[PDB]
From Swiss-Prot, chain A:
Region of the whole protein represented: 1899 to 2027 of 2335
Subunit: Part of the U5 snRNP complex. Component of the U4/U6-U5 tri-snRNP complex composed of the U4, U6 and U5 snRNAs and at least PRPF3, PRPF4, PRPF6, PRPF8, PRPF31, SNRNP200, TXNL4A, SNRNP40, DDX23, CD2BP2, PPIH, SNU13, EFTUD2, SART1 and USP39. Component of the U5.U4atac/U6atac snRNP complexes in U12-dependent spliceosomes. Within the minor spliceosome, which acts on U12-type introns, interacts with PPIL2 and RBM48. Core component of U2-type precatalytic, catalytic and postcatalytic spliceosomal complexes. Found in a mRNA splicing-dependent exon junction complex (EJC) with SRRM1.
Domain of life of the organism encoding this protein: Eukaryota
Species name: Homo sapiens
Disease per record: Retinitis pigmentosa 13: A retinal dystrophy belonging to the group of pigmentary retinopathies. Retinitis pigmentosa is characterized by retinal pigment deposits visible on fundus examination and primary loss of rod photoreceptor cells followed by secondary loss of cone photoreceptors. Patients typically have night vision blindness and loss of midperipheral visual field. As their condition progresses, they lose their far peripheral visual field and eventually central vision as well.
Cell location: Nucleus; Nucleus speckle
Protein's name in the database: Pre-mRNA-processing-splicing factor 8
Notes concerning its domains: The MPN (JAB/Mov34) domain mediates interaction with TSSC4 and SNRNP200. Has structural similarity with deubiquitinating enzymes, but lacks the residues that would bind the catalytic metal ion.
Tissue: Widely expressed.
Swiss-Prot record, chain B:
Native source organism of the sequence: Homo sapiens
Family statement drawn from the similarity comment of this UniProt entry: Belongs to the helicase family. SKI2 subfamily.
Subunit structure, as described in the record: Component of a core complex containing at least PRPF8, SNRNP200, EFTUD2 and SNRNP40. Component of the U5 snRNP and U4/U6-U5 tri-snRNP complexes, building blocks of the spliceosome. Component of the U4/U6-U5 tri-snRNP complex composed of the U4, U6 and U5 snRNAs and at least PRPF3, PRPF4, PRPF6, PRPF8, PRPF31, SNRNP200, TXNL4A, SNRNP40, DDX23, CD2BP2, PPIH, SNU13, EFTUD2, SART1 and USP39. Component of precatalytic, catalytic and postcatalytic spliceosomal complexes. Component of the minor spliceosome, which splices U12-type introns.
Name by which UniProt lists this protein: U5 small nuclear ribonucleoprotein 200 kDa helicase
Domain of life: Eukaryota
Domain remarks: Contains two helicase domains. The N-terminal helicase domain has catalytic activity by itself, contrary to the C-terminal helicase domain that may have a regulatory role and enhance the activity of the first helicase domain.
Gene designation per UniProt: SNRNP200
Compartment(s): Nucleus
Known function: Catalyzes the ATP-dependent unwinding of U4/U6 RNA duplices, an essential step in the assembly of a catalytically active spliceosome. Plays a role in pre-mRNA splicing as a core component of precatalytic, catalytic and postcatalytic spliceosomal complexes. As a component of the minor spliceosome, involved in the splicing of U12-type introns in pre-mRNAs. Involved in spliceosome assembly, activation and disassembly. Mediates changes in the dynamic network of RNA-RNA interactions in the spliceosome.
Tissue occurrence: Widely expressed.
Swiss-Prot record, chain C:
Entire-sequence positions represented here: 436 to 683 of 683
Post-translational modification, as annotated: Ubiquitinated. Undergoes 'Lys-63'-linked polyubiquitination by PRPF19 and deubiquitination by USP4. 'Lys-63'-linked ubiquitination increases the affinity for PRPF8 and may regulate the assembly of the U4/U6-U5 tri-snRNP complex.
Localization per record: Nucleus; Nucleus speckle
Region (Mediates interaction with SART3): 1-115
Protein name per UniProt: U4/U6 small nuclear ribonucleoprotein Prp3
Function comment: Plays a role in pre-mRNA splicing as component of the U4/U6-U5 tri-snRNP complex that is involved in spliceosome assembly, and as component of the precatalytic spliceosome (spliceosome B complex).
Lineage: Eukaryota, Metazoa, Chordata, Craniata, Vertebrata
Subunit structure: Component of the precatalytic spliceosome (spliceosome B complex). Component of the U4/U6-U5 tri-snRNP complex, a building block of the precatalytic spliceosome (spliceosome B complex). The U4/U6-U5 tri-snRNP complex is composed of the U4, U6 and U5 snRNAs and at least PRPF3, PRPF4, PRPF6, PRPF8, PRPF31, SNRNP200, TXNL4A, SNRNP40, SNRPB, SNRPD1, SNRPD2, SNRPD3, SNRPE, SNRPF, SNRPG, DDX23, CD2BP2, PPIH, SNU13, EFTUD2, SART1 and USP39, plus LSM2, LSM3, LSM4, LSM5, LSM6, LSM7 and LSM8. Interacts directly with PRPF4.
Disease note: Retinitis pigmentosa 18: A retinal dystrophy belonging to the group of pigmentary retinopathies. Retinitis pigmentosa is characterized by retinal pigment deposits visible on fundus examination and primary loss of rod photoreceptor cells followed by secondary loss of cone photoreceptors. Patients typically have night vision blindness and loss of midperipheral visual field. As their condition progresses, they lose their far peripheral visual field and eventually central vision as well.
Cystine crosslinks: none
Organism field: Homo sapiens
Length: 129, 70, 224
């Protein structure tokens, strides 16, 4: 995030700092949805950090006040940003794994967002059945 | 539409829409008003449709680009 | 007369009615009349019912859950307000207009106050007579305040406690009984410096004994 990298690179001494990753969401949504959208946003940033930064501001009139980190958005604006970021997070899974996004069931999209992946080099264990 | 879920499926039923009534200067024109170049094309049809008669002069007497949203 | 079903019997009746309504709903859902009930989801319930869909679109799920919560509150609030509408008409006209059923007998209380020179006590007595719909009159004379109040039994029981305990020279009820019909009109004030002018006014309605009892009580109090 733009408010953390340059902040800590030029910190001349070790120190302890406090941030509020929930800017003003807690005034309109519960901590469960706040954490879910925060995990989704962080996953999107970890995925691209290039298109995601474009998604994070949906309109040229959306700015981030110096008090907090994420931009201030309307509730439905946040809904649209979250669905766009979900599409972004599914995009690299579709690309780097050469699979269709529609082939992803609602159960495995959740695993993709969270960050759980499975592999199986030893398919010969098909002998068990 | 009904938009009601009876048992396992939601059935939405919209009824039969009433047709547009013909005005005092709009009627189903027969094949007796078509010219000789157009009377040969209407073989077996003594009359024409309502949409064919409502835009008859706009497509046969006028050579403009017609856009029929039928 | 009416009968009172006991507490266990009330519990049985309520339980049977609730089970009847529940079975009505269950058979409506069985036959497809009503859509099957949706799970009731609160904020603490959001991660158990909508958990898998709240990771993909967390804010849409939050909005849907809060809309369901509001709709549950919308129904309850509307229901309470709808029943409350009854009071709108059944209030100062049907929840405060009783009149104590004063049709066959009017309880009459006659009090004799020694000092009633304060207008605040007379105004409070007039307000209590007009609010409780109790008829009567008040006659003033030299150290004699004869207040006759004819009304219902509840209004007489309220006026006996208001004049003897809620209002302060001493007040004593000289005659507490019932009558056939009403004799005095609305609550009015009348000052009579002479006893004959008060006795002629009390005899116009056939209540001349109230002044003679109040004169005799004052004579018996001044004698001993």
């Amino acid at each position: 995030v733009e408010k953390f990298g340059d902040l800590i690179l030029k910190a001349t001494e070790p120190q302890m700092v406090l941030f509020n990753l929930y800017d003003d969401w807690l005034k309109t949504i519960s901590s469960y949805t706040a954490f879910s959208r925060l995990i989704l946003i962080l996953r999107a940033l970890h995925v691209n950090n290039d298109r995601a930064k474009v998604i994070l501001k949906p309109d040229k009139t959306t700015i981030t006040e110096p008090h907090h980190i994420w931009p201030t958005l309307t509730d439905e604006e946040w809904i649209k940003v979250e669905v766009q970021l979900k599409d972004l997070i599914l995009a690299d899974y579709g690309k780097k794994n050469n699979v269709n996004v529609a082939s992803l069931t609602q159960s495995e999209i959740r695993d993709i967002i969270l960050g759980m992946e499975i592999s199986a080099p030893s398919q010969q264990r098909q002998q068990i059945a | 539409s009904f938009r009601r879920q009876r048992k396992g499926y939601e059935e939405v039923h919209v009824p039969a829409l009433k047709p547009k009534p013909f005005g005092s200067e709009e009627q189903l024109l027969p094949v007796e008003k078509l010219p000789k170049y157009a009377q040969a094309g209407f073989e077996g049809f003594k009359t024409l449709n309502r949409i064919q008669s409502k835009l008859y002069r706009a497509a046969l007497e006028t050579d403009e680009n017609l856009l029929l949203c039928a | 007369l009416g009968v009172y079903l006991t507490k266990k019997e009330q519990k049985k009746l309520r339980r049977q009615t609730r089970r009847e309504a529940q079975k009505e709903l269950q058979e409506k859902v069985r036959l497809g009349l009503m859509p099957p009930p949706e799970p009731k989801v609160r904020i603490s319930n959001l991660m158990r019912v909508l958990g898998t869909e709240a990771v993909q679109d967390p804010t849409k799920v939050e909005a849907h859950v809060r809309a369901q919560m509001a709709k549950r509150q919308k129904a309850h609030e509307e229901a309470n307000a709808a029943r409350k509408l009854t009071a709108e008409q059944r209030k100062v006209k049907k929840i405060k207009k009783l009149k104590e059923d004063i049709s066959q007998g009017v309880h009459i209380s006659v009090y004799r106050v020694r000092n009633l020179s304060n207008p605040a006590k007379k105004f409070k007595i007039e307000a209590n007579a007009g609010q409780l719909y109790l008829t009567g009159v008040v006659v003033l004379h030299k150290d004699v305040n004869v207040v006759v109040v004819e009304g219902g039994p509840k209004a007489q029981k309220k006026f006996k406690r208001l004049m003897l305990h809620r209002i302060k020279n001493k007040c004593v009820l000289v005659w507490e009984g019932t009558a056939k019909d009403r004799s005095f009109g609305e609550m009015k004030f009348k000052q009579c410096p002479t006893e004959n002018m008060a006795r002629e006014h009390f005899k116009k309605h056939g209540a001349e004994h109230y002044w003679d009892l109040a004169l005799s009580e004052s004579v018996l109090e001044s004698t001993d």
